[PDB]
Design a protein around this ligand. Sequence first.
Ligand SMILES: NC(=O)c1ccc[n+]([C@@H]2O[C@H](COP(=O)([O-])OP(=O)(O)OC[C@H]3O[C@@H](n4cnc5c(N)ncnc54)[C@H](OP(=O)(O)O)[C@@H]3O)[C@@H](O)[C@H]2O)c1
Ligand SMILES: NC(=O)c1ccc[n+]([C@@H]2O[C@H](COP(=O)([O-])OP(=O)(O)OC[C@H]3O[C@@H](n4cnc5c(N)ncnc54)[C@H](OP(=O)(O)O)[C@@H]3O)[C@@H](O)[C@H]2O)c1
Ligand SMILES: C[C@@H]1CCN(Cc2ccccc2)CC1=O
Ligand SMILES: C[C@@H]1CCN(Cc2ccccc2)CC1=O
Lengths: 288, 289
Amino acid sequence: KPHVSLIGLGNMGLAIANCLIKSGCKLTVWNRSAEKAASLVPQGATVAATPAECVASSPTIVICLLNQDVVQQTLDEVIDLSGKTIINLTNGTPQQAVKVATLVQQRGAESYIHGAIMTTPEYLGQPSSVTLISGPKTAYESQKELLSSIGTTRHVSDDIAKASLLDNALLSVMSGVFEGWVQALAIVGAAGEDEVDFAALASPLVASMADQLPVIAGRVREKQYVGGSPITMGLEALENISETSRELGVGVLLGSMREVMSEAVKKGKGGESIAGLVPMLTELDKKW
Amino acid sequence: NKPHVSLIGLGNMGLAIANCLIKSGCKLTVWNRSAEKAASLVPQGATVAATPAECVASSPTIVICLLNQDVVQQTLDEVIDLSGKTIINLTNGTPQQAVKVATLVQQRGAESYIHGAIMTTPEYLGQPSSVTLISGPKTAYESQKELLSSIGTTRHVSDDIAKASLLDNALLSVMSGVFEGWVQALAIVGAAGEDEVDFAALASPLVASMADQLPVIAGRVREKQYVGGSPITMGLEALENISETSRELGVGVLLGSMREVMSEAVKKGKGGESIAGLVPMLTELDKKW
Ligand SMILES: NC(=O)c1ccc[n+]([C@@H]2O[C@H](COP(=O)([O-])OP(=O)(O)OC[C@H]3O[C@@H](n4cnc5c(N)ncnc54)[C@H](OP(=O)(O)O)[C@@H]3O)[C@@H](O)[C@H]2O)c1
Ligand SMILES: NC(=O)c1ccc[n+]([C@@H]2O[C@H](COP(=O)([O-])OP(=O)(O)OC[C@H]3O[C@@H](n4cnc5c(N)ncnc54)[C@H](OP(=O)(O)O)[C@@H]3O)[C@@H](O)[C@H]2O)c1
Ligand SMILES: C[C@@H]1CCN(Cc2ccccc2)CC1=O
Ligand SMILES: C[C@@H]1CCN(Cc2ccccc2)CC1=O
């Protein structure tokens, strides 16, 4: 059986551990809270006392910690990475991926690849569950069979930072959808409506909007901001969402969207489509 | 002969309604504050009324599509007599605004008032895939159903006049969040030198995974089930990394209300809960996040 080490046994790390044991790995684990390995012990996992001991146990090291600062802290006293391949599945920024890749290279690592898991723990290991991988193609090819334990991989780039770039863009879309969905369900529930019946009404209309995301992308690329749905009109609709909510005693999200649309109107872009908001963001480092 | 219909409002959506009503065979009379927006309708046989009152006198059915319900109310200050008139109001507004305008139209003697929420853009109006939600008296809806088929498929959601606007506001909340996240995503990948169209293709099946989990979250919200494998603490860390990814590229960042409500959920002891746990954050407190 191939020896694999895993650092991190949180919600996603434990799911990774179970996938690696099911695929036939000899697994060594480490977690700050060592008790999170308990369900792995009857399955034959070994628990390392320290990160260094965990890394010493295997030639392939998978990491899945909260963030890349925690990865750097955890690898602090891991002096010898010669012969080791690092597979980092920890969310972070593009430059954080560069920082961790450089750290492990300085300690003699053979390769670093980054992955962004685009599913939740309970679906990890299913073929529909995608993980985006970035890093040298030779390293991806060497790890692809091990990685198939967690589902389908997609090699998106040889640049080690690109999985995190794409992760952050995809999680932006997901965060916006969830912000809008939480607002919608708060309104519907406070009004005495049934959330499940509402979802049956809303899901197909969301599917339609999903099919326009590509249309918007092309217009953004081509700087085409003229259409039939101007920002002034969308902002009026958002102000009515606030008031609908307030009347029901419900709080309101979507404030950054109101603020960037309001400023677009002040700047003379009120007749533009929401594509016109993209340059509002790219031209200024500001939290709206 | 062609049935007479009047339309108040010739903006982006009002002009698209006008064209649909003309294509379906109506004798259309229109009014708009900026009267020149009727110019493309005149060669098609539309009549232009001087005033809102003259527009309403011209037909038994009056469609309204104005910016907001305050503009509808300002226009109704100019319309005293709605005897023999059915009003179809397709103006976005709040549930209470719909109740108020229904009362104003009743005081003017209207036969009926129905409210509609158009859930598409102007260029798609008239397609049978395009949905408009309708609320108000079912007899009035059934009498207007053939006329309304000019703008696509209608769905009568409730006899309660406020319901189309309640559902519109909730659906537009979802759409606004989708757009907010998509603008952020496109700004990041554009600034990074990536192609937006290729990103949309890469994103397609992943956005699909996201859109199938909306009914799952709804059921969890209804049943108050907030425990899962994707805690708010972890999601908040990912959102903080979106801000820093954006800053590394010189790009601004949206999603602030989401970061704020999630931070407060952590303060209230809900950091281990799922997204569904944010819904009671909103229903328990009138606050702008
Ligand atoms: N869960 C998901 O749905 C999901 C989906 C896709 C990707 N991911 C990504 O997977 C990564 C892990 O997420 P998760 O859901 O497993 O989060 P989690 O359940 O909160 O687990 C966090 C992990 O980080 C460790 N950790 C946190 N702070 C630490 C510190 N100061 N020192 C040492 N260890 C520390 C935790 O150790 P303890 O056990 O000792 O607390 C635990 O192993 C994140 O980057 C996340 O974005 C998660
Ligand atoms: N994608 C869309 O465009 C879309 C989708 C679904 C629903 N809707 C809804 O349709 C309604 C109309 O939207 P739209 O896109 O047509 O907006 P629009 O192009 O901005 O048109 C606004 C309309 O309201 C009129 N108006 C504004 N302020 C006025 C005032 N103070 N007094 C008199 N008239 C005034 C305008 O008259 P002037 O021409 O004289 O300015 C124009 O007729 C809104 O409630 C919107 O939410 C729009
Ligand atoms: C599809 C999964 C969902 C869990 N992850 C984080 C997350 C972020 C915000 C809200 C819930 C979960 C990202 C994913 O890729
Ligand atoms: C489906 C159409 C798309 C334009 N929407 C305008 C809008 C609303 C909120 C935020 C941005 C744009 C309204 C709609 O109903």
